[PDB]
Amino acid sequence: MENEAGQLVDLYVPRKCSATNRIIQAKDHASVQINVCAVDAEGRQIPGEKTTYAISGFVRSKGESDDCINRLTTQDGLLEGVWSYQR
Amino acid sequence: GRVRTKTTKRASRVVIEKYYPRLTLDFQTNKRIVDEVAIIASKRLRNKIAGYTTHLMKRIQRGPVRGISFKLQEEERERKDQYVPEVSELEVDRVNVDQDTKDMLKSLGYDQIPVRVL
Amino acid sequence: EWVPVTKLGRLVKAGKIKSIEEIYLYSLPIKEYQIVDYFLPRLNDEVMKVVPVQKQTRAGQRTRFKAFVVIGDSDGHVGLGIKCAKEVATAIRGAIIMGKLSIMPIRRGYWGTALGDPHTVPVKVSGKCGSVTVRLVPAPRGAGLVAAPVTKRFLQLAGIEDCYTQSRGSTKTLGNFVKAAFAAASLTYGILTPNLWAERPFGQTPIEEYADILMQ
Amino acid sequence: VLAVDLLNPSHESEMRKHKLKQLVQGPRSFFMDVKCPGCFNITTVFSHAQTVVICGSCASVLCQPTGGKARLMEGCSFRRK
Amino acid sequence: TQKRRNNGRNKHGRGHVKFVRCINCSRAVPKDKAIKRWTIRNMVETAAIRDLSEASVYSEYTIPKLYIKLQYCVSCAIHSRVVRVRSREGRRIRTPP
Amino acid sequence: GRPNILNATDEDIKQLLAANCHIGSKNLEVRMDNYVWKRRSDGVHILNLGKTWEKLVLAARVIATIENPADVCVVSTRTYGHRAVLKFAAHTGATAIAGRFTPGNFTNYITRTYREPRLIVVTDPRADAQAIKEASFVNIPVIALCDTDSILNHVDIAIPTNNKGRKSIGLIWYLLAREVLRVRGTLSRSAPWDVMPDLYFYRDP
RNA sequence: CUGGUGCCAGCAGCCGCGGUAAUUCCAGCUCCAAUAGCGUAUAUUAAAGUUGUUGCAGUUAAAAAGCUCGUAGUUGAACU
RNA sequence: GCCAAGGAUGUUUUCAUUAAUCAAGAACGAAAGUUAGGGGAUCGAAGACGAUCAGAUACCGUCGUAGUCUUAACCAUAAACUAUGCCGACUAGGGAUCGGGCAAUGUUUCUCGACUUGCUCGGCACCUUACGAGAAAUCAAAGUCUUUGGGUUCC
RNA sequence: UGGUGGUGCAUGGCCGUUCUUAGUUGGUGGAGUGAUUUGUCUGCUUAAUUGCGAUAACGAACGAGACCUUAACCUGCUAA
Ligand SMILES: [Zn+2]
Ligand SMILES: [Zn+2]
Incomplete structure (x- = not known):
């Protein structure tokens, strides 16, 4: 949020989940974020370059973390032939 | 009831794991080495420790015991763990008992020519 | 040490x-x-x-x-x-x-136009623990902390100057009362406001950024 | 799950569903044309016919009304359109 | 406090069940609420088979047996030890031992 | 996006087929309806090898890009996976736990067994449900070898394999270790690894 | 804090104190809230989300009628 | 055996809002109780005897009244219970089970039936879990309620 | 000032029973809003919470055990 001066005033801006778009609480210990690096031809992944996904504790407890991660990787192009929108 | 105590159990465990290679199954000799290594307060406790130790020696000689380990057993584990036979899951001519997996292989495009059926 | x-x-x-x-x-x-x-x-x-x-x-x-x-x-x-x-x-x-x-952390906002530093809870936040529910609702500037002495002291330490509180259940159990008030104060960051619609770049995390120092 | 193409369901999924629970409800029956084993005429019969249909030419009972689809007994070939 | 989900007996979709009589005391007990036990016994003792075989005819013919069913009320079953009080967690185990 | 070099590797596909890594159990659990092929007769679910391999490479990439190799925990309560996890921890800088789990390792910061890793790989969610529970408690991502009869609660990456046979366990852990070793460091893709998957198998003996 | 009585005298809106060490009984002292005001009794309001339209509750604390039909009454699928 | 009726299912069958809830108002309403008739084997209120303890007077054993049966008239309640009003929508995983329907170049039987498997609708339920609820026991409803409002009776 | 004048329901020290046997107190974690619970036990065994074993528990301590006295079997190790 911003005041009249236009400067963002708050303790922090909580990270929104990448699957269901929900706020991750400060004590949401079930929520985790995973990182997958970028690989070129013949392995030898490039250091310093990676894409991260945050999965909320509610999703992980419900058991939808695997499917949500599969969907996110398919959208970002890091995974193929495992997640189908048609179902 | 001749059930030993935890002090005797731990004392017996430490002496066997510390002096296994040079230990002797004879009661007089193992009592001797127990006296020379331990700082045991009383002879009665020393004798009970020696008696439990030599019983563990007979038990190990009859069969391996997972409750106690030493350098010889660690070396045996680190030697047997490297055993490897010839390949078993890429051998025996071809895969067997594959009815619908052939259909899934053809659909996937990674079809393997060697297939039996039932 | x-x-x-x-x-x-x-x-x-x-x-x-x-x-x-x-x-x-x-x-x-x-x-x-x-x-x-x-x-x-x-x-x-x-x-x-x-x-x-x-x-x-x-x-x-x-x-x-x-x-x-x-x-x-x-x-x-x-x-x-x-x-x-x-x-x-x-x-x-x-x-x-x-x-x-x-x-x-406690999120604070404004009752009306955002002038000066935040003074009140942004939205209506509630918390229930054992049939005792405490409802914190935003109040205009200068309205004070209309609450019980226990909840008023909790909100003073929380940094909120103006807030209206509603309580239900057996408030005589102070343990449940403070737990419900703490839950109501702590759930403010858990309400997705239209302000929190911009997507953050999903930062590096301190452990993943500073894992090299984690040696010896 | 949590991402389902409700607008375009799977063809197999629609088949393994009740006639009403589909995205768009519709009949599962069909009208077929039957020729008598010893004649040349045509007759249109319903899959779930409730009454016995009688051929106008020399023929036996065309179909038997069961609980669901009508039983076909004589040696006739049916076309579905 | 509803101790048992069944409320002590298995009955669903019904309003009345014809009652039966106990054995040790012959109390009025509902048909489902009773305890049904099977006692398949032989007509001779385990040590009496030899005596019967020595003193029987028809080329050591098969000795018959008796099948009888016992219906026990709650109090009689507990007293006769065919049914015993169990813990709260162990109550749910409906499988026979 | 995804390079074509990371592919089926037909030879390893045949190895998985011979090791019965697609012959699952009789239940489905719904949560892995997408990971199974058409239902074989007498109620045996066959797992999609292409999807299984894709999840395996994804798991290997997740295990990669970790700055400290020593904060990757491995859990295997069942005796089948003892050899596989020991060889995984020998070839890779990760750590492995076999048999007893001693609940309270990731929590209970006073005990000596406290380690706090960064990522946990689990041989079987059903047999290692304690480890997954503590990982959810202490904010750690989870990769697990899961069958059709496995609960996927608090499991972020799942490898849909048999998880039951010793051949399936050993081959998958060998493939996972080989993939993570080919992703970085050494052991180029063209050159086959000197070690072979039968080392990961646990003998009686 | 100090003297007198000692489950008695008595307080005491409620809990509760009083059978010799009485911070609650009666006398001295000090302090506390208000101040030309303080206290008491009654009627009402807020408390009372214990009259609930906002806004109660009905398995076990108070409460789903033995069941069914059904009139006033209430509510009433989509489309111009 | 006859008569009248009922739900679910199948249906490219017919009308087209004809529906939900009920103050009042009425039908049915266990057992026991009442009025009479018929009938009354066993059990059995009341009662009759004999141990029983100090007293038994009640439990126990035998007999035994009204009653338990039926017909024609009554009433109107019980732990009449799922201690949980009715209608409508949504909400997770599994396996059994009753009725119906669909499919099987599956097994079997002197044209169909029996068994098995899959899908679906309508019921009786069971196990796990708790996103969710509660004061908790527990609950797929007692959930979708301080983020409080789908409609409507009783209390 | 003395009191073998009273108060063991004011107590100190001690002693006798509970208990000639076998449990007790924490911490860090897990469950419950909370009172509380696990740790402190399916099983086997011992006099023993003694031990093996699984084990949302892990790590500890006290006690028991352990320790001390006595009773015989024997050693020419400085003896009377
Ligand atoms: Zn015809
Ligand atoms: Zn009885």
Whole structure:
């Protein structure tokens, strides 16, 4: 949020989940974020370059973390032939 | 009831794991080495420790015991763990008992020519 | 002397984590109270109550003094600690430790036009724990803290100057009352407002950014 | 799950569903044309016919009304359109 | 406090069940609420088979047996030890031992 | 996006087929309806090898890009996976736990067994449900070898394999270790690894 | 804090104290809230989300009628 | 055996809002109780005897009244229970089970039936879990309620 | 000032029973809003919470055990 001066005033801006778009609480210990690096031809992944996904504790407890991660990787192009929108 | 105590159990465990290679199954000799290594307060406790130790020696000689380990057993584990036979899951001519997996292989495009059926 | 045992504690001892909000951003569990002490000094605590909860043992009775402590910085951080110990001093210090371990961020907003620093809770936030529900609703500037003395003191330590409170259930149980109020104060960041619609770049995380120092 | 193409369901999924629970409800029956085993005429019969249909030429009972689809007994070939 | 989900007996979709009589005391007990036990016994003792075989005819013919069913009320079953009080967690185990 | 070099590797596909890594159990659990092929007769679910391999490479990439190799925990309560996890921890800088789990390792910061890793790989969620529970408690991502009869609660990456046979366990752990070793460091893709998957198998003996 | 009585005298809105060490009984002292005001009794309001339209509750704390039909009454699928 | 009726299912069958809830108002309403007739084997209120303890007077054993049966008239309640009003929508995983329907170049039987498997609708339920609820026991409803409002009776 | 004048319901020290046997107190974690619970036990065994074993528990301490006295079997190790 911003005041009249236009400067963002708050303790922090909580990270929104990448699957269901929900706020991750400060004590949401079930929520985790995973990182997958970028690989070129013949392995030898490039250091310093990676894409991260945050999965909320509610999703992980419900058991939808695997499917949500599969969907996110398919959208970002890091995974193929495992997640189908048609179902 | 001749059930030993935890002090005797731990004392017996430490002496066997510390002096296994040079230990002797004879009661007089193992009592001797127990006296020379331990700082045991009383002879009665020393004798009970020696008696439990030599019983563990007979038990190990009859069969391996997972409750106690030493350098010889660690070396045996680190030697047997490297055993490897010839390949078993890429051998025996071809895969067997594959009815619908052939259909899934053809659909996937990674079809393997060697297939039996039932 | 404090010796760190967790990786986050070791990083804090090295003084490399920027602020406690960085930890709050990724929800890292806190097991030591020294990290909270270093990142949040001049925390003022209040002892709400001490009660002699007893157990009917075989011969006599096992009595343990239960102490409730609310510790806050009066700037946006509060914590609630309930500890049972044999005496008042050990119970109070224990409850302070739990409060430090349970320090939570409080989001503050404005009743109307955003002028000056935030003064009130942004939206209506509620919390229920054992049939006792506490509802914090925004109040205009200068309206004060219309609450019970316990909840008023909790909100003063929380850093909110204006707020209207509604209470239900058996409020005479102070333990449930403070727990419900703490839940209501802590759930404010859990309400997705239209302000929090921009997507953040999903930062590097302190552990993944500073894992190289985690050697020897 | 948590991402389902409700607008375009799977063809197999629609088949393994009740006639009403589909995205768009519709009949599952069909009208077929039957020729008598010893004649040349045509007759249109319903899959779930409730009454016995009688051929106008020399023929036996065309179909038997069961609980669901009508039983076909004589040696006739049916076309579905 | 509803101790058992069944309320002590298995009955669903019904309003009345014809009652039966106990054995040890012959009390009025509902058909489902009773305890049904099977006692398949032989007509001779285990040690009496030899005596019967020595003193029987028809080329050591097969000795018959008796099948009888016993219905026990709650109090009689507990007293006769065919049914015993179990813990709260162990109450749910409906499988026979 | 995804390079074509990370592919089926037909030879390893045949190895998985011979090791019965697609012959699952009789239940489905719904949560892995997408990971199974058409239902074989007498109620045996066959797992999609292409999807299984894709999840395996994804798991290997997740295990990669970790700055400290020593904060990757491995859990295997069942005796089948003892050899596989020991060889995984020998070839890779990760750590492995076999048999007893001693609940309270990731929590209970006072005990000596406290380690706090960064990522946990689990041989079987059903047999290691304690480890997954503590990982959810202490904010750690989870990769697990899961069958059709496995609960996927608090499991972020799942490898849909048999998870039951010793051949399936050993081959998958060998493939996972080989993939993570080919992703970085050494052991180029063209050159086959000197070690072979039968080393990961656990003998009686 | 000090003298007198000692489950008595008595307080005491409620809990509760009073059977010789009475911080609650009556006398001295000090302090506390208000101040030319303080206290008491009654009627009402807020408390009472214990009259609930906002806004109660009905398995076990008070309460789903033995069941069914059905009139006033209430509510009433989508489309111009 | 006859008569009248009922739900579910199948249906490219017919009308087209004809529906939900009920103050009042009425039908049915266990057992026991009442009025009479017929009938009354066993059990059995009341009662009759004999141990029983100090007293038994009640439990126990035998007999035994009204009653238990039926016909024609009554009433109107019980732990009449799922201690949980009715209608409508949504909400997770599994396996059994009753009725119906669909499919099987599956097994079997002197044209169909029996068994098995899959899908679906309508019921009786069971196990796990708790996103969710509660004061908790517990609950797929007692959930979708301080983020409080789908409609409507009783209390 | 003395009191073998009273108060063991004011107590100190001690002693006798509970208990000639076998449990007790924490901490860090897990469950419950809370009182509380696990740790402190399916099983086997011992006099023993003694031990093996699984084990949301882990790590500890006290006690028991352990320790000390006595009773015989024997050693020419400085003896009377
Ligand atoms: Zn015809
Ligand atoms: Zn009986």
